[PDB]
Amino acid sequence: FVSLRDVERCVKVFRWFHDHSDMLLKELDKFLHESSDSTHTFERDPVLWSLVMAIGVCYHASLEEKASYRTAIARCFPKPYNSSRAILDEVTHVQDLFLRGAPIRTNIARNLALKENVFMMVICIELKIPLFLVGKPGSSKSLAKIIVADAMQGQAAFSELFRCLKQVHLVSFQCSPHSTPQGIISTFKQCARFQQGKDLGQYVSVVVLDEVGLAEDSPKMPLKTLHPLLEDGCIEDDPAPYKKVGFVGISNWALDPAKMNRGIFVSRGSPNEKELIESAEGICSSDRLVQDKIRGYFAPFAKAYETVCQKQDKEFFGLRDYYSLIKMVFAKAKASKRGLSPQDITHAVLRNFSGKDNIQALSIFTASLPEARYKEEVSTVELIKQNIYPGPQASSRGLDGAESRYLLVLTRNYVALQILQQTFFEGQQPEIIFGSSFPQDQEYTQICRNINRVKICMETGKMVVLLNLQNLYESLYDALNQYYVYLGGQKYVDLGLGTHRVKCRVHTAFRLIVIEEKDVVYKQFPVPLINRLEKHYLDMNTVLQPWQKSIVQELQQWAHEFADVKADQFIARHKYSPADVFIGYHSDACASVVLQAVERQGCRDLTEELYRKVSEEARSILLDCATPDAVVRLSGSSLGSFTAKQLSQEYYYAQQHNSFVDFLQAHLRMTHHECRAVFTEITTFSRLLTGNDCDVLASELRGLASKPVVLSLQQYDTEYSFLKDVRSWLTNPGKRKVLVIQADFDDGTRSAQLVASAKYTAINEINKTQGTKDFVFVYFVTKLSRMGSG
Amino acid sequence: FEKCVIEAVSSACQSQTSVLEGLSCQDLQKFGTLLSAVITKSWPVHNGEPVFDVDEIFKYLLKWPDVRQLFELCGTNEKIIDNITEEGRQLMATAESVFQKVAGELENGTIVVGQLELILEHQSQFLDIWNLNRRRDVRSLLKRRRDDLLFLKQEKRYVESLLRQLGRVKHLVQVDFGNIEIIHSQDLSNKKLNEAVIKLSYKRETHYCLSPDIREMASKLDSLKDSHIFQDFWQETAESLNELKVSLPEVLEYLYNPCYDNFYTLYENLKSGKITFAEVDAIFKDFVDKYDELKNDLKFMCTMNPQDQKGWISERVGQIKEYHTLHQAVSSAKVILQVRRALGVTGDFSVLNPLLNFADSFEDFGNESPQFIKAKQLLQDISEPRQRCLEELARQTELVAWLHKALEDINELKVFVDLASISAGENDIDVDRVACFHDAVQGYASLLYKMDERTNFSDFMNHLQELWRALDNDQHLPDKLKDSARNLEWLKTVKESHGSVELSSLSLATAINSRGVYVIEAPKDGQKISPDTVLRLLLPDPEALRTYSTEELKELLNKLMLMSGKKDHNSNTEVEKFSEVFSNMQRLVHVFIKLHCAGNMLFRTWTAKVYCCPDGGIFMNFGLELLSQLTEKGDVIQLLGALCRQMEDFLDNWKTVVAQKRAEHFYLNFYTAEQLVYLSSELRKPRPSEAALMMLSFIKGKCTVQDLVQATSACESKADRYCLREVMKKLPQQLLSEPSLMGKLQVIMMQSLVYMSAFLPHCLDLDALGRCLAHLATMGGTPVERPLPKGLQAGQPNLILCGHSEVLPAALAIYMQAPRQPLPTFDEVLLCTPATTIEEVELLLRRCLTSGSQGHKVYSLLFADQLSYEVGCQAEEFFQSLCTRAHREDYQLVILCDAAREHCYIPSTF
Amino acid sequence: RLESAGLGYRVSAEETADRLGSIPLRQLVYRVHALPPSLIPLVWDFGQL
Numbered sequence A: 001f002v003s004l005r006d007v008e009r010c011v012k013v014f015r016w017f018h019d020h021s022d023m024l025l026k027e028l029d030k031f032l033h034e035s036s037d038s039t040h041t042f043e044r045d046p047v048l049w050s051l052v053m054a055i056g057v058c059y060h061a062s063l064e065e066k067a068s069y070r071t072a073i074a075r076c077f078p079k080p081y082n083s084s085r086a087i088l089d090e091v092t093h094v095q096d097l098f099l100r101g102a103p104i105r106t107n108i109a110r111n112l113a114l115k116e117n118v119f120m121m122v123i124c125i126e127l128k129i130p131l132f133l134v135g136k137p138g139s140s141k142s143l144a145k146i147i148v149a150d151a152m153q154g155q156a157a158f159s160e161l162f163r164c165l166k167q168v169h170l171v172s173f174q175c176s177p178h179s180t181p182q183g184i185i186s187t188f189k190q191c192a193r194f195q196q197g198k199d200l201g202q203y204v205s206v207v208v209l210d211e212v213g214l215a216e217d218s219p220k221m222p223l224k225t226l227h228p229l230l231e232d233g234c235i236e237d238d239p240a241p242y243k244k245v246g247f248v249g250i251s252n253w254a255l256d257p258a259k260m261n262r263g264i265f266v267s268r269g270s271p272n273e274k275e276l277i278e279s280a281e282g283i284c285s286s287d288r289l290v291q292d293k294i295r296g297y298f299a300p301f302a303k304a305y306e307t308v309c310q311k312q313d314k315e316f317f318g319l320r321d322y323y324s325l326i327k328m329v330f331a332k333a334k335a336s337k338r339g340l341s342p343q344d345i346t347h348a349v350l351r352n353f354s355g356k357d358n359i360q361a362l363s364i365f366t367a368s369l370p371e372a373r374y375k376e377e378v379s380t381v382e383l384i385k386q387n388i389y390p391g392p393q394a395s396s397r398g399l400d401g402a403e404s405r406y407l408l409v410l411t412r413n414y415v416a417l418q419i420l421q422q423t424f425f426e427g428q429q430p431e432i433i434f435g436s437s438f439p440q441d442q443e444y445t446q447i448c449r450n451i452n453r454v455k456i457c458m459e460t461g462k463m464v465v466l467l468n469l470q471n472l473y474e475s476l477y478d479a480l481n482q483y484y485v486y487l488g489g490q491k492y493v494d495l496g497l498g499t500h501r502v503k504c505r506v507h508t509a510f511r512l513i514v515i516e517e518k519d520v521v522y523k524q525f526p527v528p529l530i531n532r533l534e535k536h537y538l539d540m541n542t543v544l545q546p547w548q549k550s551i552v553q554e555l556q557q558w559a560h561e562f563a564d565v566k567a568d569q570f571i572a573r574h575k576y577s578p579a580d581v582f583i584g585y586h587s588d589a590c591a592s593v594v595l596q597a598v599e600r601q602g603c604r605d606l607t608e609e610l611y612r613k614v615s616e617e618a619r620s621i622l623l624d625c626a627t628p629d630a631v632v633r634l635s636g637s638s639l640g641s642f643t644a645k646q647l648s649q650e651y652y653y654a655q656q657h658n659s660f661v662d663f664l665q666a667h668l669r670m671t672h673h674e675c676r677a678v679f680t681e682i683t684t685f686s687r688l689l690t691g692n693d694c695d696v697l698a699s700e701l702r703g704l705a706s707k708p709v710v711l712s713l714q715q716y717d718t719e720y721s722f723l724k725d726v727r728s729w730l731t732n733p734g735k736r737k738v739l740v741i742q743a744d745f746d747d748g749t750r751s752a753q754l755v756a757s758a759k760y761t762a763i764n765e766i767n768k769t770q771g772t773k774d775f776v777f778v779y780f781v782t783k784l785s786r787m788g789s790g
Numbered sequence B: 001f002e003k004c005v006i007e008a009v010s011s012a013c014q015s016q017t018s019v020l021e022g023l024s025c026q027d028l029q030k031f032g033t034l035l036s037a038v039i040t041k042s043w044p045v046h047n048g049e050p051v052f053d054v055d056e057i058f059k060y061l062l063k064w065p066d067v068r069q070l071f072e073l074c075g076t077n078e079k080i081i082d083n084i085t086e087e088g089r090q091l092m093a094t095a096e097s098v099f100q101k102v103a104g105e106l107e108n109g110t111i112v113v114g115q116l117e118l119i120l121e122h123q124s125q126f127l128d129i130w131n132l133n134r135r136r137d138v139r140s141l142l143k144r145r146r147d148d149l150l151f152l153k154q155e156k157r158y159v160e161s162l163l164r165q166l167g168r169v170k171h172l173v174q175v176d177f178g179n180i181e182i183i184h185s186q187d188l189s190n191k192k193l194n195e196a197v198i199k200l201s202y203k204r205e206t207h208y209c210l211s212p213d214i215r216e217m218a219s220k221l222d223s224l225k226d227s228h229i230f231q232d233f234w235q236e237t238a239e240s241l242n243e244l245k246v247s248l249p250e251v252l253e254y255l256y257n258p259c260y261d262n263f264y265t266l267y268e269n270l271k272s273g274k275i276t277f278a279e280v281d282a283i284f285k286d287f288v289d290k291y292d293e294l295k296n297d298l299k300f301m302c303t304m305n306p307q308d309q310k311g312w313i314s315e316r317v318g319q320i321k322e323y324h325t326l327h328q329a330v331s332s333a334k335v336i337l338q339v340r341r342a343l344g345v346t347g348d349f350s351v352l353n354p355l356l357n358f359a360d361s362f363e364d365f366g367n368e369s370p371q372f373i374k375a376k377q378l379l380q381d382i383s384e385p386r387q388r389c390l391e392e393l394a395r396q397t398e399l400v401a402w403l404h405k406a407l408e409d410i411n412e413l414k415v416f417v418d419l420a421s422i423s424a425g426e427n428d429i430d431v432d433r434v435a436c437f438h439d440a441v442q443g444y445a446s447l448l449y450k451m452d453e454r455t456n457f458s459d460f461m462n463h464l465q466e467l468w469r470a471l472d473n474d475q476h477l478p479d480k481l482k483d484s485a486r487n488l489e490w491l492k493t494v495k496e497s498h499g500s501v502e503l504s505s506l507s508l509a510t511a512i513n514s515r516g517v518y519v520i521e522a523p524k525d526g527q528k529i530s531p532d533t534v535l536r537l538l539l540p541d542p543e544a545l546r547t548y549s550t551e552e553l554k555e556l557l558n559k560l561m562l563m564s565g566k567k568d569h570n571s572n573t574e575v576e577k578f579s580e581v582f583s584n585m586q587r588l589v590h591v592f593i594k595l596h597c598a599g600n601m602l603f604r605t606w607t608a609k610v611y612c613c614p615d616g617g618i619f620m621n622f623g624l625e626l627l628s629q630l631t632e633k634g635d636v637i638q639l640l641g642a643l644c645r646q647m648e649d650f651l652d653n654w655k656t657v658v659a660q661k662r663a664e665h666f667y668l669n670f671y672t673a674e675q676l677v678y679l680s681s682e683l684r685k686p687r688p689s690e691a692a693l694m695m696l697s698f699i700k701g702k703c704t705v706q707d708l709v710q711a712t713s714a715c716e717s718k719a720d721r722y723c724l725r726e727v728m729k730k731l732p733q734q735l736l737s738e739p740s741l742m743g744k745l746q747v748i749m750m751q752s753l754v755y756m757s758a759f760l761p762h763c764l765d766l767d768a769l770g771r772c773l774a775h776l777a778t779m780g781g782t783p784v785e786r787p788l789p790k791g792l793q794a795g796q797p798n799l800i801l802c803g804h805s806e807v808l809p810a811a812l813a814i815y816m817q818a819p820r821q822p823l824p825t826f827d828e829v830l831l832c833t834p835a836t837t838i839e840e841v842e843l844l845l846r847r848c849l850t851s852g853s854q855g856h857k858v859y860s861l862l863f864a865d866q867l868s869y870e871v872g873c874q875a876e877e878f879f880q881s882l883c884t885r886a887h888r889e890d891y892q893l894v895i896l897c898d899a900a901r902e903h904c905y906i907p908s909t910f
Numbered sequence C: 001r002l003e004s005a006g007l008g009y010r011v012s013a014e015e016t017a018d019r020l021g022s023i024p025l026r027q028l029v030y031r032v033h034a035l036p037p038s039l040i041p042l043v044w045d046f047g048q049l
């Protein structure tokens, strides 16, 4: 019910267009003379065109019945605007002019959503009237925000139109359901502090609540005090200048209309097939030959996306996946220079459309495309390899506009890490940013250091394997959108810690893998995080071939027969579990060790020669973690007496299990598998090292070791103590360094879950600190008992 | 040996190695056991024998090679099939019935075409198995069916090319596709007998192509779907119809035939070379410097009319290439005249006048213009790029005027970059502006600094040669020129900059590490003791000082956490040092506020000025006139870590000792920790505060200062005066035996734990408070007696489920069983609410099971289901704890809960 | 139109806390709370414009 409150908020907007009605008409004449024919080259009134712009901003953008409004409003205009076609082409040309005033972008659609969005937000933040955008993932609101960010700078604009306009300085606040009103009060006071002391005619700041649709019904009621903050600037003080602040309230959720009726609801609609194929044209318009080569696939992809998005009840898929499919087939058509073989289409639709269990997206996309049927099987491992290790030619031409999104793996019980640093991470290991579990650490300093490490990995250009996202979804969301700001040919994502959003450099080849569990990603992630990140499933079965499944079943029954011994030397009835004999067995370790065996083989072909040696080498790594009383008990076991003799000979002649130091002399003399960093954890039943055992180990390791240092996890309350001890160990001179990290489990202390944190911290330190000449051997010893703690 | 060899068969058939290709195995019993083994251990299990079908067994038969050898050798002799098993012969019979059904379905057309693609991919194995089935025509029948399959696949290709060609104009004119719109979308799980290779000849399919006209149309569109020129003609003649739902037979006449006529006139024009330049630069404009696709496109272009392509392709591709390089040379000449004008160099060129006099000329022929070729020998190899570099030079005139005005030479750049790197910001765009400007002017210094005002053409191209060498190392250089040219306002402010008083976000951290004094105060003002207002930080200099709060520290930490990469050790080691001393100091604030909120009264006046200086030290102080100043130098990090460790140890010891002090005194369990602190502060005064009188009136009743001074005058004897003076004597000789601070700190916290009242000579200890409250309650007699009702056990918890509307009347119904008793008070009843502290229910459990109480009372826990998960779980552990330790077995604990909310913790586990 | 505006509402209409009667304030024209009594018999309307 904005009767007689939109006209007094619209005469001011008409006055704003009428005051600036001197250069806009010259810009329109130049744009319609240099890009159109002579029919759009008529004299335009400075006041009637301003009136059409005023009614196009005040009423035409918010409505979904725009044709009825245009045919019911054109009967009052004079001769040059008698028809609705004239108003349509006029608002289209001015929106295209405001898009052309922005910096030039490649592979970005010229759809009505982007131009309409940037039109309304620019005109609404010159006039300090709040914008309240709503929509769904793929509606181009954040992409229009980042366009306004680098388009309408005051004296440094790309065009001569925005140079005469105001300067913007945006502060962001990604709202959450657990958001206090003091946060938005502090945001409004902070942007008032930016606005204080500057000229108001050439400097305006805006707040952007990027997820305001989350916090509408929190029991603390955070969005109830936004009503004065949009009108008088602040609460419990007199009205004053440098307090009224503009607002672009971008939301992915539908809002409450009663307290947001003060602004303009630019409510975005669901995409039809015409808008989808227009966006498909806009994200292929950068080239003209392969556009006309792959124009035929746009309508079947649009129909298949429509059937996929209408099939599922939960909004798991969005427009971002279809746009990424269009960009990927465009890049493959440009690089191929011959057309599109159907394996490219199947690879694109399986790399992009994935993640949901009850979705056969390949069958749906080949239902409308019967020609692109691929009868050969494709697995997840080559998809992950082609998404993490791309081709050399990709992102090598003039600027980057076509690439993939940031990968995500869907797993259970944290299994992705083993298969990631076994299979795919080749050459350079990534930096694992993770939730360090050292006691009494502060979480704020931890996430500050984590995002600093992410920024350093972005600047230096190395992969990021995140293991937490609930602490970083508010603080890393802009980098995941894969939109860049260019300054001298260098990309710039936005990073923020609370209320401090600054740009950070991005290298040419930078990947970011997120690892999360299936339950938390399916009922804890808010759902726009799903659309940004490319989904994949590599938990345990997709990499494991059926012959390796036969081998893991055979090794499970072989370990069960290894642990099964019958004897009458001692009169007792004690059944030995495979966890008793093979220490650490948890009915899942046979799959990990067959993965280790098939990668230690390295040839990967079934000619009946590789099968027996991968089976026997898997059996070797099982017996390599066997307690010696079991391997001398093996003579009366179910396996036999010649097999037991061969396994005892393997345990006592080939593998050195006598002591720690003998394992050191057996480990250093052999040249390894082209690795500058050999890691090995050790399970001990004896007492750990005291401080004089490392001295004698240096005494008979005088020619190989470099004074190994022992580290106890009891003494390390804070991460920085472990960091300074490891860093002091790296900076010592000499090669072939030895590290011994000890931890005890059978005592009153808590430190048993700190092992993984210490291991990942050691990997991060050796990745960020080691040079190119020094070999490093890190050993992790742990103390366990035979009284049930084993 | 039978069991190990069947397991070896299973392991070698589990791999993809064929077992029997060298077996001369004339003992037929063991051979039949091996045959039973290879059948039952090679059969396609799918988590353990489902088959139920025909396709997977048939794929199994065609792909694995031992099956044909199996059927050959068991069909060789009947003395081998008699001794297999009962099971293996059943599976061989099932496979043979499946193969007989399938390859007897080839004799008619009823065969599913999936099996047809399988047998044509697997020709030799199918021929072998069929020749063995022959002993219980096939070459020509397979070639006939293969020819009909290839015709079907090419007809599906023709029809699919037709749907995609008519789908690229779906916005303009829409077509009703007869019946073909459904027939084409359906899969090929369809019977082959529906594709009707009849006689008297033609071969109609389920795609009912309405004539051979649309069939030959689809063939010509399939041969011409990769011609971009044809697609251009298609869309420019299908815009000639305008919203019309149209049928397929008039699509051939209203839309296809004029397109074909235009395409055929263009073809017979291009075969001669009579085409004019207007269509040449109107159609081929998007092919500039991409001539291999155009060679392929003219090859595909002459596949329409099937004759030779020898003297037609290469001369006209070269002619169009010469035309394209001609127009590129024209645009390059216009931009080089624009940069010769805008740079101010007058010079002399005199060789590009007839090229521009040709640029406004117009001729109509397709022939090679000769006299310009030598002129264009000056501009052969510029590129289609690098003309962009000349137009950002020729369009940015304000920057080249400012560079001739303000810098004037190459040699001031090395001092200008250093003068700008101070005045630039701290974020990464602001820093990288200097390097973009530097690389821009180092890339254009060959032109903007080395030109004479009158240069000839030869040395001008000689300098553009090394300009292009400088451009070859950096493709992003004109964007660097543009992004430097849009920073002219910054470049004007740099030189005339006064002292810009903003220190930094980096050197502020160095100032904190140089003279920052972290101060914990625990303020004595009227504000609360929140963790924001206990931590301060001071920066001295002149003589002014700056006080930093916690949130300003967090904001500056966020600011300095996201700077650009200096790639030097000092910056990241000082921000790491500041961040970790701040984290350790905040950990100290956390442990100190835990010890304050637990109630300590020793560190209520504590302060600790912590210096961040190298060898700065920690200067603690107390508000006591019987203690000295504690100070110790050294490094800050591990000393604050150790100090927080003994402070946490003192927290655990203080919690344990206050637990065992609550376990001994009963009247001390009425009041919480802060009320105990208030009472210990207020009872020592000669006139105590009236809030303490009212809050102690629940114990005595009509509390009076005369009764209070009588109760506190006889609560302690004169031997404690000896004990406290012994504390004052023995400690100054004890702190001097330890030179460090940690040992004397441990000594003073032990001595405050065991003998508390000597350190604070203005407050009562918990023994004196408990004795005074016990004497006060002993003075006020006639205690309350309350029995439990009938059916209520007086030694066990009584969980009662009443319902939400009848909890509150039921409690008063319980308490009204004894008439003439006084109404209850804040003891024995807790109206539980969401967000209830664990301390109040813990003190209730201390109240109802403490031995010295001189009476029986009914203790109620109303609305006990309203507790949280953690609070209810900790209350359960606490009740189990004190029932384990020590209690009286005649307590009356009554629990009332809502009966409609039984899914929570505490009534379900009770 | 509101529940079809992009993604739906975060909470449903049955677990919504800010009710007036049986109706949420989300579906009202003005997000206003209930008038206390003795102000109900004193209100009086202006014109309808």
Ligand SMILES: Nc1ncnc2c1ncn2[C@@H]1O[C@H](COP(=O)(O)OP(=O)(O)OP(O)(O)=S)[C@@H](O)[C@H]1O
Pocket (backbone or CB within 6 Å): A107, A108, A109, A110, A111, A113, A114, A135, A136, A137, A138, A139, A140, A141, A142, A143, A250, A251, A252, A279, A320, A323, A324, A481, A482, A483, A528
């Ligand atoms: N014209 C366009 N319209 C929509 N999405 C686009 C467009 N051009 C590119 N995109 C893709 O959309 C993403 C960037 O914009 P979006 O993130 O979809 O904006 P958004 O849909 O408003 O997201 P929200 O609502 O802020 S979470 C990238 O994955 C782009 O590849």
